[PDB]
């Protein structure tokens, strides 16, 4: 399993950077100074690579959400904790969001890509739901459609990470952060 | 211009429906029933192929956006009608999707992409914009920042086309239509 981890790791992160179609199993290889042999004993078909990159996702997602909003007993906190781990900042949460972006196109495609898009998608979804729910029982947030509310901040999460990922002239991660806050504010809270 | 307009109109098509890096020179070729050095000869790159792709697709919408909106002299249907032009309808439309998914993807690795997608999506941002200045002129529209409005409703956008794209379980052109002119009536309309 270490070897595996490590090339699990490895091919995620060149999928995010240099995107899934540009990177063949030798620049895995290489990466590692191991033979394309090996990186087959693990990963049959370079499909399985990009799956198991969104599986990578999907995990990294769900673990970081688990650790950092179970504990936040205020559901205002706690929504707005959750757009921040969402935001594509430098490093891995850039990384993820590239990830993310070639999956939603794959997904246009592939319907195993697609099924599991919509597997992850729709637990990400259902977090924000919640996340609303809880905060109208709470007093705290506004008796609106919980599901038309986290289809549209989910809409706009994604649609405002696109402009940062792409460089929409006076898009940063702090706009988007300011953005999101404004709505929840203004469309959420109560 | 004829062949070049044909071979064009192909390969755009093809990336739409396989995939940029899915498509060869001798795919484009086989479908016009054509050489590899003839695509070569009006295409000197792979890389400028996706580039008059994304070029093709700018005209594509402006194109569409003159002929059906400076007619419209109310600014509240003209908003719907606009709004109504992005959908991503079977055929083109979805096809028009598919290439701006792949974009955004190259956008986040080429320069040139970049560019010129950052282009086309401000003058996207734009009309969008002036339509809402349009709107508050006329008294239809609420006086909030229209760059911000605009900000939001193209985010808006372009996160509930992923999830039409992408087979959201329950989302359909029709719900996507649905939230966008929701949105428009309770949060722009006065």
């Given at each position: ?51 198991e990159a969104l599986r990578r ?134």
């Amino acid at each position: 399993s270490e070897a595996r981890r490590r090339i699990l790791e490895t091919a995620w992160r060149l999928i995010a950077r240099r995107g899934y179609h540009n990177v063949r199993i030798h620049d895995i290889a290489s990466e590692l100074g191991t033979s394309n042999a090996t990186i087959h004993y693990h990963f049959p078909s370079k499909k399985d690579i990009l799956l198991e990159a969104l599986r990578r996702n999907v995990k990294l997602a769900f673990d970081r959400q688990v650790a950092e909003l179970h504990t936040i007993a205020d559901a205002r906190e706690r929504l707005v904790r959750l757009v921040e781990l969402q935001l594509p900042t430098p490093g891995l949460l850039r990384d993820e969001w590239s990830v993310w972006l070639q999956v939603w196109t794959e997904s246009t495609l592939n319907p195993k890509i697609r099924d599991l898009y919509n597997d992850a998608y729709d637990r990400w979804y259902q977090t924000i739901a919640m996340t609303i729910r809880t905060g109208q029982k709470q007093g705290v947030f506004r008796d609106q459609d919980a599901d038309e509310l986290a289809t549209r901040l989910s809409a706009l999460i994604d649609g405002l990470g696109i402009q940062v990922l792409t460089g929409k002239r006076g898009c940063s991660v702090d706009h988007m952060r300011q953005h999101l806050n404004d709505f929840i504010e203004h469309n959420i809270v109560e």
